Design a protein around this motif. Sequence first.
Motif, mmCIF file in Angstrom:
data_model
loop_
_atom_site.group_PDB
_atom_site.id
_atom_site.type_symbol
_atom_site.label_atom_id
_atom_site.label_comp_id
_atom_site.label_asym_id
_atom_site.label_seq_id
_atom_site.Cartn_x
_atom_site.Cartn_y
_atom_site.Cartn_z
ATOM 1 N N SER A 116 42.218 38.916 37.721
ATOM 2 C CA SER A 116 41.148 39.890 37.887
ATOM 3 C C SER A 116 40.133 39.470 38.945
ATOM 4 O O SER A 116 39.718 40.295 39.767
ATOM 5 N N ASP A 117 39.717 38.199 38.932
ATOM 6 C CA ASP A 117 38.644 37.748 39.810
ATOM 7 C C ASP A 117 39.000 37.879 41.283
ATOM 8 O O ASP A 117 38.107 38.083 42.115
ATOM 9 N N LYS A 118 40.285 37.750 41.628
ATOM 10 C CA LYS A 118 40.693 37.811 43.028
ATOM 11 C C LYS A 118 40.351 39.160 43.649
ATOM 12 O O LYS A 118 40.183 39.253 44.866
ATOM 13 N N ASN A 119 40.251 40.214 42.834
ATOM 14 C CA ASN A 119 39.884 41.527 43.352
ATOM 15 C C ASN A 119 38.409 41.611 43.754
ATOM 16 O O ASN A 119 38.014 42.598 44.383
ATOM 17 N N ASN A 120 37.589 40.608 43.416
ATOM 18 C CA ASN A 120 36.188 40.548 43.821
ATOM 19 C C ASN A 120 35.936 39.620 45.006
ATOM 20 O O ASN A 120 34.774 39.408 45.365
ATOM 21 N N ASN A 122 36.908 37.961 49.043
ATOM 22 C CA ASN A 122 37.369 38.312 50.382
ATOM 23 C C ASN A 122 38.391 37.267 50.826
ATOM 24 O O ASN A 122 38.033 36.196 51.326
ATOM 25 N N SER A 151 50.544 39.962 39.618
ATOM 26 C CA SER A 151 49.317 40.591 40.101
ATOM 27 C C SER A 151 49.091 40.398 41.599
ATOM 28 O O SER A 151 48.131 40.957 42.138
#
Length: 279
Positions: A116-120, A122, A151
Amino acid sequence: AAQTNAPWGLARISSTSPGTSTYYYDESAGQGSCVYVIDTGIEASHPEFEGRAQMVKTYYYSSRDGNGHGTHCAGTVGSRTYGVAKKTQLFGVKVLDDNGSGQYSTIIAGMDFVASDKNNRNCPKGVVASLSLGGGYSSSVNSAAARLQSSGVMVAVAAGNNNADARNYSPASEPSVCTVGASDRYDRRSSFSNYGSVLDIFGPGTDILSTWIGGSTRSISGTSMATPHVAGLAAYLMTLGKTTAASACRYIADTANKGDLSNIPFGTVNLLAYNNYQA
């Protein structure tokens, strides 16, 4: 680019022969990629990380690495002197306590956290996760590693240090992630390295010099040390555009040095990670 008098493992992944001392690599150096190190934490203030490391999550009272293991692994991924991918961005997730142990429920949570965190973040060139941990077989731990890979994250995991078949250890035994054995400076399988058909690739794992807590350095041994060589190599290749997170493990196997290792049991791959650098 060339680093003279490099740690032997860095020199080995840029050479077709053992015994060299220079690490040859493209100047891009993993810039624009991101590597999550899921471990005991990272001493982000270490000068060797140059401001490129950050703790993002802890499952304990502090985010500090009070052990050293996670800082060592992160240093092999991306520290200036000891790292494969010298310009990558490092994120620390503390799932292991300062004694180096952790419950499976916490390790699973840390994997789901990264997905999930990777989507926040850059990370235009892609995302890697390095897991230098493991224990006895667990289908729930394997499933969490498969989710993280699915993912869109290149997952590299340690084969384990039991001189046994990795089929009985997790997340080493999950087929969909990249399972990493250890070799030594004479191109032998490390005496402690697990083996078996689930192994994908070998990397340097015996007597690996890297960062340690307190702003120090030290040399230690394990499949825990081979795994970040492969994680950093993946980040480096993704930045160059040669592969993606979904196919990096296969690409690394395809382009590996083949047949050069000794003491490999029949049925285990004889493949050593290699960056194929050409000046």
